[PDB]
Symmetry: D2
Subunit: 348 residues, 4 copies
């Protein structure tokens, strides 16, 4: 056609989501893990559970073998701490990036710019299935309208990226998702964008999306009431009590329950992975001191601490992030016990 596809170099074939769902169907145990975890988070968001939702795991996944080793370790802590914590593993397959660089396992699983995205969807769905089947709920992030269709049935909770909290199509996506959804404050600390996203997400919408058959269609949503805010810092951290008090009043003024998930990382740690433990110390003191509004937290965590560069061409160390730096496993075990001990103190 005329005036068409000048900046399009190549269109290639994408497996429809039904192909991935048929190849990797939920087991009964995987469907049970998803169903129970969703209901558990719903119960927390409705104020009928005094436990803390904990979304913890690698910035994103690059190696399914390290990821499954991580998942086994976190699952054991999930079983031991389940009276205090609802633990859900961060299983992200995309790292949003303004600059050039690896976009994540789905876009480029081979980490060599071969962009084998069908491979990446097979790898990602298989891993999510394996983790759920083991008993460990999974948390994802929704950056687009096409990718979630491949994985959403195995997600117990998801986040909308801070760079898309204001995006109408991402708010509409949320309003048709089957899992709970967290919306982050704006990259400058602004609360109102996230509150508007929750109100928009709770409403029905009619909009254009893609089906499980890989076809575009008109979709009508019912609205999603299981949405909440994620405090992730602005120019300065916003995890402290003063900020929690402001957000609580702000939600209540908007008619929303005063409830918050606090991201320990990103701008709340000033992108310094060890300060997640300093954020943890303060949030725990808030929780132990009686703060009911804090219903969840987020932590970037891996088997080995820190990060490493894909671009150097050095062989990758095992179990170490190639994107944001994470706390290692020993900090991760201590952090989770701190949280469980703060939830118990909140109670007694």
């Amino acid at each position: 056609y005329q005036n068409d596809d000048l900046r399009i170099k190549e269109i290639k074939e994408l497996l429809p989501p039904v192909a991935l769902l048929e190849k990797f169907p939920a087991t009964e145990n995987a469907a049970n893990t998803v169903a129970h975890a969703r209901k558990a988070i719903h119960k927390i968001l409705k104020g009928n559970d005094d436990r803390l939702l904990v979304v913890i795991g690698p910035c994103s996944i690059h190696d399914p073998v390290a990821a499954k080793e991580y998942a086994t370790r976190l699952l054991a802590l999930r079983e031991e701490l389940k009276d205090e914590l609802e633990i859900v593993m961060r299983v992200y397959f995309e790292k949003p990036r303004t600059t050039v660089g690896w976009k994540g396992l789905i876009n480029d699983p081979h980490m060599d710019n071969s962009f084998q995205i069908n491979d990446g969807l097979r790898i990602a769905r298989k891993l999510l299935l394996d983790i759920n089947d083991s008993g460990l709920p999974a948390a994802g992030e929704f950056l687009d309208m096409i990718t979630p269709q491949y994985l959403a049935d195995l997600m117990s909770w998801g986040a909308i990226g801070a760079r898309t909290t204001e995006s109408q199509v991402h708010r509409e996506l949320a309003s048709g998702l089957s899992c709970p959804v967290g919306f982050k404050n704006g990259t400058d600390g602004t609360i109102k964008v996230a509150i508007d996203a929750i109100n928009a997400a709770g409403a029905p919408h009619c909009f254009l999306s893609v089906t499980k058959w890989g076809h575009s269609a008109i979709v009508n949503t019912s609205g999603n009431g299981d949405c909440h805010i994620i405090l992730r810092g602005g120019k300065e951290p916003n995890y402290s009590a003063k900020h929690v008090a402001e957000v609580k009043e702000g939600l209540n003024k908007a008619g929303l329950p005063a409830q918050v998930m606090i991201d320990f990382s990103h701008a709340n740690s000033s992108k310094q992975f060890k300060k997640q433990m300093d954020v943890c110390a303060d949030v725990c003191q808030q929780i132990a001191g009686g703060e009911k509004a804090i219903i969840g937290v987020m932590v970037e965590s891996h088997l080995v601490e820190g990060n490493q560069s894909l671009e150097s061409g050095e062989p990758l160390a095992y179990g170490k992030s190639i994107t944001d730096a994470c706390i290692g496993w020993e900090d991760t075990d201590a952090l989770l016990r701190q949280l469980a001990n703060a939830v118990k103190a909140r109670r007694g």
Copy 2:
């Protein structure tokens, strides 16, 4: 699919391109206007790009009446201005409101999006066939597949300037793209978007066949900033120099488009005329960085609420025709001065 109440059939883009193909005239209108904006953006034309038109389209009849008026002014001032009609089919907002001609053309909450796409693509076709190039707004990644072959220039929504999927959209679009600065006035987000949209990308998208696919884009060098104001207006000569310094440090061409409306006009539509005045003086004074402007105009001035008048915005207030005739000549005279 607990929160999915209903799925309904959507015509693939290839059906609206087949029903409403570009005329040779509409295609030349698109080709020449894109090339012209490219030349302006490459620093090889001293002409000013003027994107001007209704806040949002609601009445195709009134849209065509306005297009005919603007076409004459476009013919008359073509030595100074590359005039392009603002053809936006929705006003992005946060709560209730008519979602626009595409989402609800029958203005009854029926959401006849297939009808809406027909009506919107026909309108875009008619306007391009008459000779008037069109500017659009790209809010999602599926709608542009139906309309973008008829667009000479596009703006990414202010609320999606920061979104990776919308920067990747821009990277594969066949027209120039404007990115608005942040709500606080800062320009880092738009600089990042321009840089993002300028690189090749591989991502998932829907083709003209209505099927999802893996898409590889080339990158889009014809991107630029749009100054729409932050808490304070950012149209003044001091603000332009500051942005031009910021652009230069980022290795980006020191060029800007100034939106006269919204916050740069203090929400007062008639005040867009005061921005013309300041902007015109800057141009007549020699300022070569201002390569474009954006103005909200209709046949009748102001706004109205669906809770009747012809040619009047049912959304944001717009200047009327007399002020639009005067504003366009004011800019063309300013370009003549700077040219000397």
Copy 3:
């Protein structure tokens, strides 16, 4: 997969053709009225003959519109004895290598511009129906019919597919009457079976208007009939018509018949369609009422010609089967109308 698959190319979905070329109110009225008219004839509440007459297949839309304009004048003049519908075929089934028709290769040069062919086919078919002239088609596969069937007032199943299950299933979902041809041999059983099968509802795999494969459920087509087209020797005489009318009554199916004046009934000789027209008119004049329809291969200029690629073709002349010219065509239709006015 695909060692014998050389290339795959994109294909417009039917919704794209239906959206580009929507039925006018006139074409829709033409289609509706003609379908009602053929149903009444097939039920028995009308004595006029159904006449499906036109080129073997279309290769030149301009020539096809001149033919249609001429035929429309005669349809209006013989409308009280004849329900005239134009043969607008866009495929010629062939065993040997060669041209398969307009949709497959409209530029007749083995460029296979099938998206072009479908636009051309549907534009032509719509223009004919808007004029007021109803149209008859042939259904050779499950995919092509979706682009055209809303503009067909009647359809035939290829004689080489009359016992094919998918084709009987296709016929059970079409919105138009359908005709089933006897076998190469005079065997009429394969056609009776096909008529029963198409009257039944079925469930099978087909392609939608969106260009996607789907599971489809039909309701059954009762506006289906036989089409006698000869075999080893012709089979249009009231002797053969008797044999068939007895086998139809035997099988609970109306003893109605459509007679094809060409192909093996004409012994593959175009001019001999005039002879066949005589025997069939004699029976209709001799009171016989089973004959509800006929088929004729008819163009502007009689005969046929061999296609050479890049070579200009003679005007009005079929490049497939030989056809009778317009002069014989105007006479054959007046012969058939006289025969009906006699029937009364």
Copy 4:
């Protein structure tokens, strides 16, 4: 429009290929058997192609036990016979009746086509993966995309041999294709079908993605006739000579596949044993133009009718009657001894 009651979603072929992908053994099994039949059709191997197995499959369990037994004989007789198991998933009929495993896997008119496709592709996979090649029947244009990659040989439905679209389908298939003589015993439609299938074609079809496309095929040279009888059997030496001359007169190799059942057996399953003896006599006395045979064979001989709310005999055909295992073993040894005696 007016006569369409319901449209339901159909899994695209890529969903079945992703769920049931060829393992390495299955692709090897298919690749070797395709090459071995091609070599046989080209006259570079004196071994006899034997397609043998149930009229159609209604029970994957019985099908796999049969595959196991047949696989053991494929190994033992490989030097004389290329044994391919008949894996059909429908008994074509204009009458009333079970429409096969893909249309109706649960044998109750539930028409669970997506389930049938899963069951049919999984069974075919399991058989090929064990090392036994499979033969298919092509009745429509849509179904083969789900299965053809696991078929080493196919036959076109007898009621579709003169269909252009089925001849075009064959021109694009990756396996050899058998074409059945006409119901009157005429071999003309089979010769026309063989010629048409050998030519490249351009035609509309559905892709692995469940979308209609324009397809161009290269042409299939590995096509041959299936002699299955007419109003009288056509397996005798007089008939073979008659067809061998009709194929030479047409420029096609003088080679035939003899179907032992249906009209060639007078609709009596045990009379397949008598066709076998005659065909063995021809071969053992130097007949080289018989390159393949087709036998309807199950674990347990005969057939039975499907009843609602009632169990079925195990291993027995619910469609056409088959010879059972004991005759099947004897038949295959007879054919193998006939190749030894011809060499």
